[PDB]
């Protein structure tokens, strides 16, 4: 996606707003949006990469100025409709109901111990994305590589500021879930993962700090050899 969310290097976005302190959750609705992440994950709405792609398809003006957890709501709805698990017309009718009756009760439901077990297991065990593959790593530390200029319309982690740029492999991490398939519903198709160093001058031309570098994580198909 060449979306506005890919903001690295963008100018004119404003000074940082940073209260001297702020709570973990600023409102009750934020706790709900947060907790719906494991809930929809477990229900098959989406995986992590698809989750991000849903947010990348938001209206950019709304993305830029809305509360962060509203982005999560948007992606839950995006995938609920995509999978047919959410009926939009019912949702709109209930929205108007709770606009008019904000204190009305939530539906009656039973508590589920397995959902608490899932929560605890995910929080403390994690959802590891590393995977083993049969092919060996194509690159190694010290290799000079160039970042792909492809511009897919689907999900990927190809920030525009690094495309077509040259840098040096810093580390190979093993193979991981590949966003370019996973986020587009095409499965894990894992690929070797590398960190690559780009100098600021390579990235920004003369406007770059002469003594600064950006480290960026590249899956194997993103990078092609320059100098071994």
């Amino acid at each position: 996606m060449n979306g506005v969310y890919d903001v690295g290097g963008t100018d004119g976005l404003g000074p940082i707003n940073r209260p001297a302190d702020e709570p973990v959750f600023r409102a009750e609705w934020e706790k709900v949006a947060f907790a719906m992440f494991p809930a929809t994950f477990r229900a098959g709405f989406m995986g992590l990469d698809e989750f991000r792609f849903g947010i990348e398809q938001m209206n950019p003006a709304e993305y830029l100025e809305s509360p962060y957890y509203w982005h999560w709501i948007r992606t839950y709805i995006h995938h609920g409709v995509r999978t047919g698990k959410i009926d939009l017309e019912e949702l709109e009718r209930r929205t108007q109901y709770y606009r008019e009756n904000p204190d009305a009760p939530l539906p009656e439901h039973e508590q589920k111990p397995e959902l608490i077990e899932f929560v605890n297991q995910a929080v403390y065990g994690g959802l590891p994305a590393s995977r083993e593959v049969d092919r060996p790593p194509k690159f190694k530390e010290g290799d000079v590589v160039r970042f792909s200029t492809a511009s897919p319309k689907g999900h990927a982690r190809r920030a525009r500021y690094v495309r077509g740029k040259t840098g040096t492999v810093v580390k190979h991490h093993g193979a991981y879930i590949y966003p370019d398939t996973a986020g587009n519903g095409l499965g894990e198709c894992p690929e070797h993962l590398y960190t690559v160093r780009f100098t600021a001058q390579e990235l920004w031309g003369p406007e770059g700090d002469p003594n600064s570098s950006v480290y960026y994580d590249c899956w194997e198909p993103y990078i092609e050899l320059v100098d071994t």
Binding site: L13, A39, T195
Partner: protein, 203 residues
Amino acid sequence: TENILRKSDEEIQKEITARVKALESMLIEQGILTTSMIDRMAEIYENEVGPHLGAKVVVKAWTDPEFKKRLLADGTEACKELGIGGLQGEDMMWVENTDEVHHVVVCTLCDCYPWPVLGLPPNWFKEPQYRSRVVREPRQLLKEEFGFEVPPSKEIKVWDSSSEMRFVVLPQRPAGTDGWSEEELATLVTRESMIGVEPAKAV
């Protein structure tokens, strides 16, 4: 910033609240979401998982050179020694600030952040102002936003977490703390010092 198109914050909150409650009611009826499940998630990240965990690693590395080695070779395995790990820090790589190198971490594409050692990120880390500028003008951003001046001759390395690898800064131990207890040193370790936007606390 001012946007003549934007409703008030109160009108925005009222709308989001209705929309979230409506979606919540639907997922409840599907049997996939419950109030206990919402409460547990919120309890864990309000009171259990927070930057106090990261500070324990930092002070161990500051006081245990062998642990520091292990931390810098494989961060996930090292933190596992202290009972720290899990969701959104399954792969953790720690980078050490030195006299020649300063590290700062960002996720320009979204919001990636090492939850098991820092808890959930503050809102400024997720927002477009920090994410857009730190890869482009790190030295100026650190001075203007955080009053943190990095000498021109010192290299700044910005780590853009585009993957599931999570980068965590090991800040330099402040001078004047010889022989401090691990508890006493932890009071100097801040969330900001493990993102790289501030040093650890002086004195």
